[PDB]
């Protein structure tokens, strides 16, 4: 079974995945843009590692850091999730992302990529 979820979002729903994840024994990763370095979503996991800015970059803007499949995948493998929940909006309906998770043996918490088209 799963034992580590990176929450690929922010604001309210990040927290929604956190709790329902803490409440089932499963270990929580949090992603944050430089601009959410003072946000709480980021204080409410076991761990948080900034995304959107580094040596692998230019800078991914406030939003752009949260819609970047690459960066999101980067930080998943950095901690070591065997699953991702994409919250809502942002990258949650991309069949393309489903397919990069498909590509790692990271469990996209969403639907088969065939439902997404």
């Amino acid at each position: 079974p799963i034992s580590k979820i990176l929450v690929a979002n922010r604001s309210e729903i990040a927290i929604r995945v956190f709790r329902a994840a803490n409440e089932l024994g499963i270990k929580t990763v949090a992603i944050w843009a430089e601009e959410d370095k003072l946000a709480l979503h980021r204080f409410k996991a076991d761990e948080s590692y900034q995304v959107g800015r580094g040596p692998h970059l230019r800078d991914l803007g406030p939003i752009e850091s949260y819609l970047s499949i690459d960066e999101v995948i980067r930080v998943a493998k950095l901690s070591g999730a065997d699953a991702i929940h994409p919250g809502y909006g942002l990258l949650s309906e991309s069949p393309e992302f489903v397919d990069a998770c498909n590509k790692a043996g990271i469990i996209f918490i969403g639907p088969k990529a065939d439902t997404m088209r």
């Binding site: 370095k37 003072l38 204080f43 076991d46 761990e47 948080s48 590692y49 900034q50």
Partner: protein, 41 residues
Amino acid sequence: IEKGKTLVIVNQAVSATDSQGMVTVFFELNGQPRRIKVPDR
């Protein structure tokens, strides 16, 4: 502090010195205000 687990620390302001030996610096630690009194050495 840990591969975790990043502290955001801002030096807001440095006081002048008080009554146990100490100087106040006010920081911002994770956006919340902390007030540290330290011995002027």
